[PDB]
mmCIF file of all heavy atoms in Angstrom:
data_model
loop_
_atom_site.group_PDB
_atom_site.id
_atom_site.type_symbol
_atom_site.label_atom_id
_atom_site.label_comp_id
_atom_site.label_asym_id
_atom_site.label_seq_id
_atom_site.Cartn_x
_atom_site.Cartn_y
_atom_site.Cartn_z
ATOM 1 N N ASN A 265 0.378 1.487 -9.721
ATOM 2 C CA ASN A 265 -0.309 1.071 -10.934
ATOM 3 C C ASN A 265 -1.624 1.849 -10.960
ATOM 4 O O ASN A 265 -2.561 1.526 -10.222
ATOM 5 C CB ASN A 265 -0.515 -0.441 -10.916
ATOM 6 C CG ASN A 265 -0.990 -0.986 -12.238
ATOM 7 O OD1 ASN A 265 -1.200 -0.240 -13.194
ATOM 8 N ND2 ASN A 265 -1.137 -2.306 -12.311
ATOM 9 N N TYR A 267 -4.499 2.518 -11.646
ATOM 10 C CA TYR A 267 -5.931 2.247 -11.603
ATOM 11 C C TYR A 267 -6.518 2.678 -10.261
ATOM 12 O O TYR A 267 -5.936 2.432 -9.202
ATOM 13 C CB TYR A 267 -6.207 0.765 -11.860
ATOM 14 C CG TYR A 267 -5.360 0.159 -12.959
ATOM 15 C CD1 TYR A 267 -4.635 -1.004 -12.740
ATOM 16 C CD2 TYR A 267 -5.296 0.744 -14.219
ATOM 17 C CE1 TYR A 267 -3.866 -1.566 -13.742
ATOM 18 C CE2 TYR A 267 -4.524 0.193 -15.225
ATOM 19 C CZ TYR A 267 -3.810 -0.962 -14.981
ATOM 20 O OH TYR A 267 -3.040 -1.517 -15.978
ATOM 21 N N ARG A 302 -9.926 -0.811 -14.175
ATOM 22 C CA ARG A 302 -9.171 -1.545 -15.180
ATOM 23 C C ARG A 302 -8.913 -0.631 -16.371
ATOM 24 O O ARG A 302 -9.422 0.491 -16.444
ATOM 25 C CB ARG A 302 -9.906 -2.820 -15.619
ATOM 26 C CG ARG A 302 -10.826 -3.409 -14.558
ATOM 27 C CD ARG A 302 -11.336 -4.779 -14.967
ATOM 28 N NE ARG A 302 -10.409 -5.848 -14.604
ATOM 29 C CZ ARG A 302 -10.291 -6.363 -13.384
ATOM 30 N NH1 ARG A 302 -11.046 -5.910 -12.392
ATOM 31 N NH2 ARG A 302 -9.419 -7.335 -13.154
ATOM 32 N N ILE A 322 -4.429 -26.290 -20.550
ATOM 33 C CA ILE A 322 -3.262 -25.633 -20.010
ATOM 34 C C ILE A 322 -2.404 -25.254 -21.203
ATOM 35 O O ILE A 322 -2.030 -26.108 -22.003
ATOM 36 C CB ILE A 322 -2.536 -26.479 -18.947
ATOM 37 C CG1 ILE A 322 -1.396 -25.690 -18.297
ATOM 38 C CG2 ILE A 322 -2.082 -27.815 -19.512
ATOM 39 C CD1 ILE A 322 -0.844 -26.331 -17.046
ATOM 40 N N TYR A 323 -2.131 -23.967 -21.358
ATOM 41 C CA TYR A 323 -1.375 -23.503 -22.511
ATOM 42 C C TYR A 323 0.101 -23.334 -22.152
ATOM 43 O O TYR A 323 0.529 -23.592 -21.026
ATOM 44 C CB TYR A 323 -1.934 -22.172 -23.024
ATOM 45 C CG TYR A 323 -3.379 -22.186 -23.458
ATOM 46 C CD1 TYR A 323 -4.379 -21.698 -22.629
ATOM 47 C CD2 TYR A 323 -3.747 -22.722 -24.685
ATOM 48 C CE1 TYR A 323 -5.707 -21.718 -23.020
ATOM 49 C CE2 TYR A 323 -5.067 -22.739 -25.088
ATOM 50 C CZ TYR A 323 -6.043 -22.240 -24.251
ATOM 51 O OH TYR A 323 -7.357 -22.268 -24.656
ATOM 52 N N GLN A 324 0.888 -22.867 -23.127
ATOM 53 C CA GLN A 324 2.269 -22.474 -22.844
ATOM 54 C C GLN A 324 2.330 -21.357 -21.808
ATOM 55 O O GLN A 324 3.241 -21.319 -20.971
ATOM 56 C CB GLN A 324 2.971 -22.032 -24.130
ATOM 57 C CG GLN A 324 4.425 -21.630 -23.945
ATOM 58 C CD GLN A 324 4.591 -20.125 -23.845
ATOM 59 O OE1 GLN A 324 3.676 -19.365 -24.170
ATOM 60 N NE2 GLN A 324 5.756 -19.686 -23.386
ATOM 61 N N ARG A 347 -6.063 -20.419 -10.301
ATOM 62 C CA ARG A 347 -5.179 -20.016 -9.219
ATOM 63 C C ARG A 347 -5.761 -20.537 -7.915
ATOM 64 O O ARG A 347 -6.973 -20.731 -7.798
ATOM 65 C CB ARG A 347 -5.012 -18.491 -9.170
ATOM 66 C CG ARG A 347 -6.317 -17.732 -8.968
ATOM 67 C CD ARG A 347 -6.102 -16.225 -8.984
ATOM 68 N NE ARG A 347 -5.428 -15.738 -7.783
ATOM 69 C CZ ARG A 347 -6.059 -15.329 -6.689
ATOM 70 N NH1 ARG A 347 -7.384 -15.349 -6.639
ATOM 71 N NH2 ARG A 347 -5.368 -14.899 -5.642
ATOM 72 N N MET A 348 -4.888 -20.783 -6.943
ATOM 73 C CA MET A 348 -5.308 -21.243 -5.628
ATOM 74 C C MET A 348 -4.642 -20.383 -4.568
ATOM 75 O O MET A 348 -3.435 -20.131 -4.639
ATOM 76 C CB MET A 348 -4.963 -22.720 -5.408
ATOM 77 C CG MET A 348 -5.609 -23.312 -4.167
ATOM 78 S SD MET A 348 -7.404 -23.400 -4.313
ATOM 79 C CE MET A 348 -7.891 -23.326 -2.591
ATOM 80 N N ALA A 351 -2.665 -22.514 -0.746
ATOM 81 C CA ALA A 351 -2.657 -23.950 -0.484
ATOM 82 C C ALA A 351 -1.226 -24.371 -0.170
ATOM 83 O O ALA A 351 -0.365 -24.372 -1.056
ATOM 84 C CB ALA A 351 -3.212 -24.716 -1.681
ATOM 85 N N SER A 353 2.179 -26.359 1.479
ATOM 86 C CA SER A 353 2.938 -27.572 1.805
ATOM 87 C C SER A 353 2.187 -28.837 1.406
ATOM 88 O O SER A 353 2.228 -29.854 2.101
ATOM 89 C CB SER A 353 3.294 -27.609 3.293
ATOM 90 O OG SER A 353 4.179 -26.559 3.637
ATOM 91 N N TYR A 357 -3.400 -28.090 -5.114
ATOM 92 C CA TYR A 357 -3.700 -27.401 -6.360
ATOM 93 C C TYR A 357 -4.121 -28.368 -7.454
ATOM 94 O O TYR A 357 -5.124 -28.135 -8.134
ATOM 95 C CB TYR A 357 -2.496 -26.573 -6.832
ATOM 96 C CG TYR A 357 -2.790 -25.783 -8.087
ATOM 97 C CD1 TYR A 357 -3.610 -24.664 -8.046
ATOM 98 C CD2 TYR A 357 -2.262 -26.165 -9.314
ATOM 99 C CE1 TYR A 357 -3.891 -23.941 -9.188
ATOM 100 C CE2 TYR A 357 -2.539 -25.447 -10.463
ATOM 101 C CZ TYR A 357 -3.354 -24.336 -10.394
ATOM 102 O OH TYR A 357 -3.633 -23.617 -11.533
ATOM 103 N N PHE B 169 5.208 -21.977 -13.890
ATOM 104 C CA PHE B 169 3.970 -21.206 -13.840
ATOM 105 C C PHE B 169 3.009 -21.772 -12.804
ATOM 106 O O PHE B 169 2.263 -21.018 -12.169
ATOM 107 C CB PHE B 169 3.294 -21.183 -15.212
ATOM 108 C CG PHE B 169 3.925 -20.236 -16.193
ATOM 109 C CD1 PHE B 169 4.330 -20.679 -17.439
ATOM 110 C CD2 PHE B 169 4.071 -18.893 -15.890
ATOM 111 C CE1 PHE B 169 4.892 -19.804 -18.351
ATOM 112 C CE2 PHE B 169 4.632 -18.017 -16.796
ATOM 113 C CZ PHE B 169 5.045 -18.473 -18.028
ATOM 114 N N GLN B 170 3.017 -23.095 -12.619
ATOM 115 C CA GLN B 170 2.125 -23.722 -11.651
ATOM 116 C C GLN B 170 2.488 -23.346 -10.219
ATOM 117 O O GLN B 170 1.607 -23.292 -9.354
ATOM 118 C CB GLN B 170 2.151 -25.241 -11.828
ATOM 119 C CG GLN B 170 1.708 -25.707 -13.209
ATOM 120 C CD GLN B 170 0.316 -26.314 -13.205
ATOM 121 O OE1 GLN B 170 -0.518 -25.990 -14.052
ATOM 122 N NE2 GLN B 170 0.063 -27.206 -12.254
ATOM 123 N N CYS B 173 0.688 -20.428 -9.531
ATOM 124 C CA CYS B 173 -0.746 -20.676 -9.421
ATOM 125 C C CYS B 173 -1.115 -21.166 -8.026
ATOM 126 O O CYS B 173 -2.004 -20.605 -7.375
ATOM 127 C CB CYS B 173 -1.187 -21.684 -10.483
ATOM 128 S SG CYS B 173 -0.983 -21.133 -12.197
ATOM 129 N N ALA B 174 -0.439 -22.213 -7.548
ATOM 130 C CA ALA B 174 -0.686 -22.711 -6.200
ATOM 131 C C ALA B 174 -0.337 -21.692 -5.125
ATOM 132 O O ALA B 174 -0.633 -21.935 -3.949
ATOM 133 C CB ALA B 174 0.105 -24.000 -5.965
ATOM 134 N N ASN B 175 0.270 -20.566 -5.500
ATOM 135 C CA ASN B 175 0.716 -19.542 -4.559
ATOM 136 C C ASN B 175 1.619 -20.156 -3.494
ATOM 137 O O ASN B 175 1.456 -19.936 -2.291
ATOM 138 C CB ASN B 175 -0.474 -18.811 -3.933
ATOM 139 C CG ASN B 175 -1.178 -17.897 -4.918
ATOM 140 O OD1 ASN B 175 -0.537 -17.188 -5.693
ATOM 141 N ND2 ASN B 175 -2.505 -17.904 -4.888
ATOM 142 N N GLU B 176 2.586 -20.942 -3.958
ATOM 143 C CA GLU B 176 3.445 -21.723 -3.085
ATOM 144 C C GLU B 176 4.661 -20.916 -2.654
ATOM 145 O O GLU B 176 5.286 -20.224 -3.463
ATOM 146 C CB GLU B 176 3.895 -23.007 -3.786
ATOM 147 C CG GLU B 176 4.563 -24.016 -2.864
ATOM 148 C CD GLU B 176 3.589 -24.644 -1.884
ATOM 149 O OE1 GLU B 176 2.389 -24.745 -2.217
ATOM 150 O OE2 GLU B 176 4.025 -25.040 -0.783
ATOM 151 N N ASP B 207 7.809 -22.548 -18.581
ATOM 152 C CA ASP B 207 6.525 -22.888 -19.167
ATOM 153 C C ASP B 207 6.452 -24.394 -19.407
ATOM 154 O O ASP B 207 7.467 -25.095 -19.389
ATOM 155 C CB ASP B 207 6.306 -22.098 -20.460
ATOM 156 C CG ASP B 207 7.424 -22.296 -21.469
ATOM 157 O OD1 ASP B 207 8.370 -23.059 -21.183
ATOM 158 O OD2 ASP B 207 7.365 -21.669 -22.548
ATOM 159 N N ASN B 208 5.232 -24.900 -19.615
ATOM 160 C CA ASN B 208 5.082 -26.344 -19.770
ATOM 161 C C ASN B 208 5.784 -26.867 -21.018
ATOM 162 O O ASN B 208 6.042 -28.072 -21.108
ATOM 163 C CB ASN B 208 3.602 -26.752 -19.776
ATOM 164 C CG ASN B 208 2.845 -26.270 -21.009
ATOM 165 O OD1 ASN B 208 3.415 -25.679 -21.927
ATOM 166 N ND2 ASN B 208 1.548 -26.558 -21.044
ATOM 167 N N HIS B 262 -0.587 -14.389 -7.558
ATOM 168 C CA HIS B 262 -1.377 -14.407 -8.781
ATOM 169 C C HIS B 262 -2.729 -13.798 -8.439
ATOM 170 O O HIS B 262 -3.349 -14.200 -7.451
ATOM 171 C CB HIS B 262 -1.527 -15.843 -9.298
ATOM 172 C CG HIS B 262 -1.884 -15.938 -10.747
ATOM 173 N ND1 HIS B 262 -3.167 -16.179 -11.187
ATOM 174 C CD2 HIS B 262 -1.118 -15.839 -11.857
ATOM 175 C CE1 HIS B 262 -3.176 -16.219 -12.507
ATOM 176 N NE2 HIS B 262 -1.945 -16.016 -12.939
ATOM 177 N N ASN B 265 -6.362 -9.787 -11.789
ATOM 178 C CA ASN B 265 -5.763 -9.379 -13.061
ATOM 179 C C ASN B 265 -4.448 -10.112 -13.314
ATOM 180 O O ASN B 265 -3.522 -9.508 -13.848
ATOM 181 C CB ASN B 265 -5.527 -7.870 -13.080
ATOM 182 C CG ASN B 265 -5.864 -7.246 -14.419
ATOM 183 O OD1 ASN B 265 -6.948 -7.460 -14.960
ATOM 184 N ND2 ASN B 265 -4.931 -6.475 -14.964
ATOM 185 N N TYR B 267 -1.052 -10.907 -13.392
ATOM 186 C CA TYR B 267 0.071 -10.081 -12.942
ATOM 187 C C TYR B 267 0.963 -10.790 -11.923
ATOM 188 O O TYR B 267 0.883 -10.497 -10.726
ATOM 189 C CB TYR B 267 -0.447 -8.776 -12.323
ATOM 190 C CG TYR B 267 -0.804 -7.664 -13.295
ATOM 191 C CD1 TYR B 267 -0.670 -7.827 -14.670
ATOM 192 C CD2 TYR B 267 -1.270 -6.439 -12.825
ATOM 193 C CE1 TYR B 267 -0.998 -6.800 -15.547
ATOM 194 C CE2 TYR B 267 -1.598 -5.413 -13.690
ATOM 195 C CZ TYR B 267 -1.461 -5.598 -15.048
ATOM 196 O OH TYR B 267 -1.787 -4.578 -15.910
#
Side-chain angles (χ1 to χ4, degrees):
Chain A
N265 190 359
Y267 319 128
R302 332 190 86 79
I322 186 167
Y323 301 101
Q324 181 261 346
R347 59 182 288 269
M348 191 67 207
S353 295
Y357 183 73
Chain B
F169 283 126
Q170 300 255 133
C173 296
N175 289 317
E176 192 70 28
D207 56 1
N208 68 4
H262 200 260
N265 221 51
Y267 278 0

